[PDB]
Amino acid sequence: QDAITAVINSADVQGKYLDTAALEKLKAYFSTGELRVRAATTISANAAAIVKEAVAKSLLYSDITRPGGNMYTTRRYAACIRDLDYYLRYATYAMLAGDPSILDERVLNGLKETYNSLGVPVGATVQAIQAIKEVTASLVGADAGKEMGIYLDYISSGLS
């Protein structure tokens, strides 16, 4: 779901058409969509460097990457990279939609029970997502950075 389809669905539950309030919401969405496109390009530029800087800032040289931790094994480290990478990609999708419901329905459906059953720590994931938020806010800009951070904090709040 987009912001556009959210506006259309809200007007459809009302049963009326798209008059001036919904039209002004759509004009607002178009005006932010320009910088949203530019931020999508500059995020898809160096996603690997973003995940690398995030794990180097947060997860490395700790107890979980040491023997006796959740990220000790090589397959577990690769799953962490992929998981971190996914959070960046779906936060990019939710940024371009302007709507977090697609992000929620995609990952926050079952990731709580999955991280419960596998014994994955939640708070280390929250710290890693916050490190992704800082790295992307430093890389992209101020307002597109906080637009990215809204959905990244939505992910981090959904996991908690």
Partner: peptide, 12 residues
């Protein structure tokens, strides 16, 4: 229902 919401007319 794992993902969906009931009564969604658009966007699933």
């Amino acid at each position: 229902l794992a993902t969906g919401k009931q009564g969604t007319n658009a966007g699933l």
